[PDB]
Amino acid sequence: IEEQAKTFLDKFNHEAEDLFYQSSLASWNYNTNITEENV
Amino acid sequence: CPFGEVFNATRFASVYAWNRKRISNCVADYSVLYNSASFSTFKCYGVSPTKLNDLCFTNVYADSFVIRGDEVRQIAPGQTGKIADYNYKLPDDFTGCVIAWNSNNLDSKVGGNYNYLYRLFRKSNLKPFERDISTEIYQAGSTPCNGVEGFNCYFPLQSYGFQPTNGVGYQPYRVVVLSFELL
Amino acid sequence: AHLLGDMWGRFWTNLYSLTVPFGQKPNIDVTDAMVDQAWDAQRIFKEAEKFFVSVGLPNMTQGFWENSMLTDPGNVQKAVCHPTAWDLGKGDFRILMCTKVTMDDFLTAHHEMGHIQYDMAYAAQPFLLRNGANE
Numbered sequence: 001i002e003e004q005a006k007t008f009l010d011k012f013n014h015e016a017e018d019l020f021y022q023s024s025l026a027s028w029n030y031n032t033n034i035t036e037e038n039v
Numbered sequence: 040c041p042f043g044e045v046f047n048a049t050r051f052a053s054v055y056a057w058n059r060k061r062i063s064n065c066v067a068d069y070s071v072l073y074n075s076a077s078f079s080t081f082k083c084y085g086v087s088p089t090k091l092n093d094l095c096f097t098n099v100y101a102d103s104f105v106i107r108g109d110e111v112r113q114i115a116p117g118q119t120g121k122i123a124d125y126n127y128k129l130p131d132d133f134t135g136c137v138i139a140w141n142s143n144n145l146d147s148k149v150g151g152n153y154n155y156l157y158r159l160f161r162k163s164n165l166k167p168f169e170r171d172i173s174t175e176i177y178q179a180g181s182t183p184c185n186g187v188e189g190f191n192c193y194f195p196l197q198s199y200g201f202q203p204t205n206g207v208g209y210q211p212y213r214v215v216v217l218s219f220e221l222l
Numbered sequence: 223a224h225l226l227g228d229m230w231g232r233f234w235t236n237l238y239s240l241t242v243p244f245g246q247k248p249n250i251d252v253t254d255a256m257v258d259q260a261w262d263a264q265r266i267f268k269e270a271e272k273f274f275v276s277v278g279l280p281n282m283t284q285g286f287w288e289n290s291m292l293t294d295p296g297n298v299q300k301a302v303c304h305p306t307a308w309d310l311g312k313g314d315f316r317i318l319m320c321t322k323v324t325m326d327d328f329l330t331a332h333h334e335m336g337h338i339q340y341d342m343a344y345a346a347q348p349f350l351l352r353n354g355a356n357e
């Protein structure tokens with residue numbers, strides 16, 4: 001049913017925004033200061 | 040009136056289990072509040088702010104919690120959203136005042152402060168000033184799901200992961216809601 | 223195919239010195255007027271922010287000014303130097319470039335700020351719809 005999909009995406013929209021953040025914040029620290037302990 | 044704790048606390052309270060201090064017989068000076076200029080939001084609803092230091096009630100309640108920056112607009116009479124629906128609901132004839140100030144340096148910590156949760160699923164919106172600290176699993180489409188995540192079903196609490204490098208509107212704000220009542 | 227200005231003939235932009243219509247007229251270049259008024263690294267973006275507030279678009283987010291790295295650092299710091307605009311999430315927008323005082327990087331400052339103002343506008347949609355409308 002359609003209302004089950006709305007409750008699916010809200011759970012997604014909260015877990016993704018944090019996991020995309022850190023995964024892109026760590027790509028910033030590699031791009032502006034290169035070590036291999038950043039890669 | 041001992042506003043000490045109630046304001047300058049070292050650790051606030053979650054948004055899904057707000058606190059509730061019942062200020063009582065005292066000498067309250069809302070001027071030190073009103074003019075402190077440290078507050079980013081000071082709205083008064085039942086009564087304009089300057090006339091507070093000239094009235095008397097029966098009880099003042101003070102509720103305290105921590106939310107995101109752009110969720111301070113749901114702490115008002117007659118709103119909707121994840122916070123006002125089921126975390127903290129204000130009646131439709133509110134009387135007190137709502138105060139809020141940014142607290143990025145105290146509550147946000149590098150790596151993410153995962154200790155500030157909020158409820159994001161409930162059966163029905165809260166009654167005004169009602170509180171719900173249960174954790175019983177949710178319930179998606181018709182199905183048992185005897186305590187256990189999975190297809191259409193999952194915990195009801197999420198956590199702000201606050202970070203210090205978060206644009207405004209994503210940084211933690213501390214909120215205090217004063218509610219004057221007259222039994 | 224081997225006389226077009228690059229390896230594949232994709233751009234003909236390296237044929238300008240052979241195909242210039244009037245070579246006795248200098249094509250306008252404001253790089254000397256930038257180093258005659260002591261414009262720092264920060265003036266190029268502050269005049270860029272005044273262009274966008276001139277048309278009715280919001281300011282920079284004020285986290286934009288500390289977190290960003292507008293030049294290569296004062297350290298001899300190994301850091302991929304390539305103009306780009308980042309949208310890390312949670313309303314945190316950063317620009318990474320190594321800007322020199324030139325009208326070339328005066329223009330790509332306006333280009334890279336345009337990616338930011340596009341990013342700041344659709345930040346109220348859900349997460350899976352925060353791209354451009356097509357590629």
Ligand SMILES: *[C@@H]1O[C@H](CO)[C@@H](O[C@@H]2O[C@H](CO)[C@@H](O[C@@H]3O[C@H](CO)[C@@H](O)[C@H](O)[C@H]3NC(C)=O)[C@H](O)[C@H]2NC(C)=O)[C@H](O)[C@H]1NC(C)=O
Pocket residue numbers: 046047071075
């Ligand atoms: C915990 O809450 C307290 C009550 O709001 C905060 O207290 C106040 O800090 C002010 C500094 O901005 C003090 O102000 C000044 O007071 C001196 C005399 O002490 C006057 O000469 C100055 O004119 C006056 N300046 C201003 C801004 O008008 C207040 O005196 C002080 N309130 C008290 C204690 O009576 C605390 O700041 C807060 N916790 C902390 C440490 O931040």
Ligand SMILES: *[C@@H]1O[C@H](CO)[C@@H](O[C@@H]2O[C@H](CO)[C@@H](O)[C@H](O)[C@H]2NC(C)=O)[C@H](O)[C@H]1NC(C)=O
Pocket residue numbers: 029033034035299
């Ligand atoms: C690149 O960044 C890393 C981490 O951000 C730096 O490495 C260490 O960072 C910690 C902070 O958590 C410091 O306490 C250490 O002193 C750092 N290591 C060293 C050897 O200094 C690293 O320093 C950065 N690169 C440069 C060139 O400074």
Ligand SMILES: *[C@@H]1O[C@H](CO)[C@@H](O)[C@H](O)[C@H]1NC(C)=O
Pocket residue numbers: 275280281
């Ligand atoms: C943008 O910032 C400038 C100062 O940096 C300020 O004067 C201006 O009012 C701001 N724009 C808006 C719409 O507030």
